[PDB]
Amino acid sequence: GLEKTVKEKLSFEGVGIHTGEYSKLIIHPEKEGTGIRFFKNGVYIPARHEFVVHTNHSTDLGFKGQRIKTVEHILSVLHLLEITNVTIEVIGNEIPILDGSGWEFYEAIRKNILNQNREIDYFVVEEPIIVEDEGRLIKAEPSDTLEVTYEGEFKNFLGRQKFTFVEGNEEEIVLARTFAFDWEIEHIKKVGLGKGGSLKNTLVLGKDKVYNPEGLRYENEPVRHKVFDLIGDLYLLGSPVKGKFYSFRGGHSLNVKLVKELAKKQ
Amino acid sequence: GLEKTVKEKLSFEGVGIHTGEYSKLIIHPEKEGTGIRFFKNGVYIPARHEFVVHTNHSTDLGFKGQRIKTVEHILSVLHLLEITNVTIEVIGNEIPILDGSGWEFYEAIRKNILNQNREIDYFVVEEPIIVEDEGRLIKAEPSDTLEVTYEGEFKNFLGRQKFTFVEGNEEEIVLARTFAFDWEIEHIKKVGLGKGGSLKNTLVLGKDKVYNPEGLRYENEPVRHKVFDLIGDLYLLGSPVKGKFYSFRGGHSLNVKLVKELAKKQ
Ligand SMILES: CCCCCC/C=C/CCCCCCCC(=O)O
Ligand SMILES: CCCCCC/C=C/CCCCCCCC(=O)O
Ligand SMILES: C[As](C)(=O)[O-]
Ligand SMILES: C[As](C)(=O)[O-]
Ligand SMILES: [Cl-]
Ligand SMILES: [Cl-]
Ligand SMILES: [Cl-]
Ligand SMILES: [Zn+2]
Ligand SMILES: [Zn+2]
Ligand SMILES: [Zn+2]
Ligand SMILES: [Zn+2]
Ligand SMILES: [Zn+2]
Structure with missing residues (x-):
């Protein structure tokens, strides 16, 4: 391109x-x-x-x-x-x-x-790599196209679900929104964060509920959003990326860790 | 006055x-x-x-x-x-x-x-009166001064609390804020209400937590606020009120019911 x-x-x-x-x-x-x-x-x-x-x-x-x-x-x-x-x-x-x-x-x-x-x-993943952290794991391997799969294991009604992004389906993840669980709010606020969060920019979920009146855009909106987040962190490699990625319960910290390791090897 | x-x-x-x-x-x-x-x-x-x-x-x-x-x-x-x-x-x-x-x-x-x-x-309560509704009760009786007691029974950490307002202690209730329980939010939104609610104007409580980062202003802020609400509804009588009131789990509906009964009698 x-x-x-x-x-x-x-x-x-x-x-x-x-x-x-x-x-x-x-x-x-x-x-x-x-x-x-x-x-x-x-x-x-x-x-x-x-x-x-x-x-x-x-x-x-x-x-x-x-x-x-x-x-x-x-x-x-x-x-x-x-x-x-x-x-x-x-x-x-x-x-x-x-x-x-x-x-x-x-x-x-x-x-x-x-x-x-x-x-x-393009930054091309040349050899397989795995990064882990307390149960969380992200694997990267060679691929001509960018493919990103996120698998979550939530402690609420979401349970275990996954979503795979492939080139051409950008529209399937750009609408997926940031989300948070009600039991995490006090912590986020306590550490000086989430000061601008509201039901207008955050999907708030409970053990068995959805506080946003509009509900979820997709039954798996959270994992679609995690995929979206990962693709954003991957760009920290410095240029568009080509590789197949699989993330199990990953987050920004593990995403960045993967990026630095990838940058180091190549 | x-x-x-x-x-x-x-x-x-x-x-x-x-x-x-x-x-x-x-x-x-x-x-x-x-x-x-x-x-x-x-x-x-x-x-x-x-x-x-x-x-x-x-x-x-x-x-x-x-x-x-x-x-x-x-x-x-x-x-x-x-x-x-x-x-x-x-x-x-x-x-x-x-x-x-x-x-x-x-x-x-x-x-x-x-x-x-x-x-x-002044609207002076002349004789004792009681209104009830599904466990909720409010009693009004004679008094030269306005005295209002609210006793709540909450399904969360609040348990059973009581607060009594008496003339001269206005500052003890004018700071108490509106509150809601996290398990009630979906209902409120569903009935087309609570569209402007936020942590800035509402004390949101859970079974065991307080979502607002500022926490409660008083350990009994909720009952203090209920007293504040009742005093507002009592003014619907048309003039400042002189009487002793006791409300157990009362709300606006029962408050108005009481006002209408008082108005009828007197
Ligand atoms: C529940 C309703 C209202 C107000 C918003 C509550 C505050 C939420 C904090 C902002 C969300 C920040 C994202 C953190 C989520 C994560 O790391 O998984
Ligand atoms: C999980 C946290 C919070 C989301 C905050 C949404 C605001 C709540 C709705 C407004 C409350 C209005 C008061 C009515 C409650 C009542 O009568 O019991
Ligand atoms: C602000 As976020 C947790 O959606 O990256
Ligand atoms: C808005 As209200 C429930 O505090 O009267
Ligand atoms: Cl954290
Ligand atoms: Cl943190
Ligand atoms: Cl109701
Ligand atoms: Zn080209
Ligand atoms: Zn995000
Ligand atoms: Zn944190
Ligand atoms: Zn009120
Ligand atoms: Zn209702």
Whole structure:
């Protein structure tokens, strides 16, 4: 595929799910070979694993004293659409969560794709690799196409379910929203997070209930969202990825661990 | 005491807890003998029991095709400060919930009281009366001062608690907020209510937890609030009340039932 950028400046704004603060984004077009990077208060922060500073409840990046929280959703959308050159200027401390999914980003960016004059330099998984952590596991192996499977084992009515993304089915995961369990709320709040969370940007589930009046968009919306999250973290490899991935109960921490190990080997 | 009004108009705005819509109130001064009345779309709606049209999860008033939801908190504050003559213009279909208590109302009105030239004609409970409904009970009896006791019996950690309000202790209940149990949320949403509810205006409790990061303001905040609600509904009698009340598991429906029985007798 050919490298891509946006045809013109795109802007988004809204509350940040963790800071609870209002922020604004301005997606700037960039020429070939620029890569994906954020910009805040005069500092460019590459969307690469070396700049990850936090992975609890979100993937946060930082460099030279400037930090940006929750980059996983905008990065997933960029990855899915193969946007390889853009600057995400952030006026605030976190990416707006919007409705909790990548839908608004996906729709706006998709109709503004600009093909460029360079073949994409994909990060190709060359050999099988496995990372584990307290029951959690993620396996990566060679594949010409990007394939991502997430299998969850929830302690509520969701039980055990899995979902597989394959190229061409981007629309099956871009609407899946961020979710949380009611028994986790006190913890999240206690650690200074989730300050902007609400039923408008978060699917809140109980042992046997669904608090959102709109209910779930899909019976497996949570695992579709986990797949979406993983694809966003995978872009931290520095360029569109080609490989087959399987994640069992994975989260941002394990995702980043996998990325660093993959980067190290190749 | 002397009838009272406000020295100057007072405004309050925010979201309605049930409609989830923006709403605003403007309290305007009125001369002696006017009483408390709401104004909406050209219609005056007296703050009296004859105009109650709904009592499930809030006390709503209506007249000639115009309705206003959730008048209990503003009326409670007015009753407590003995404000007797005002016109409350309403923009929207419900009184803003603010933080779920009567604090903002109380502090603003308290500093803007204007004594008038006429003695207040209190509604004096003359003989004992009792109303019941599925285990719930409320008893009213004679007293030179307003005394209100609420005893709750909760299906969670709260267990059985009681709280007694007496004249002069207004500040002990004007900070107590609206509360709901996590197992009731789906029902409330299902009946088209609670659309503006959030941790900022509602104390949400579980079988063993408190979701709000700020926790409870008082270990018995819920019963203090129930006392606050009853005092607001009692003002539907048309004037400040003098009597001793005891409510066991009472709610707006039973509160209004009591008011109507008291009104009938006397
Ligand atoms: C239940 C209703 C209302 C208000 C929102 C409650 C706060 C939720 C916290 C924000 C969610 C953050 C994502 C964390 C979930 C995870 O790591 O699995
Ligand atoms: C899991 C946590 C929370 C989601 C918060 C949603 C807000 C609750 C709805 C508004 C409450 C309105 C009060 C009515 C309750 C009653 O009459 O018992
Ligand atoms: C837990 As999240 C903010 O990555 O959906
Ligand atoms: C249940 As209510 C809005 O009167 O606190
Ligand atoms: Cl944490
Ligand atoms: Cl955690
Ligand atoms: Cl009910
Ligand atoms: Zn190509
Ligand atoms: Zn945590
Ligand atoms: Zn996510
Ligand atoms: Zn109330
Ligand atoms: Zn109900």
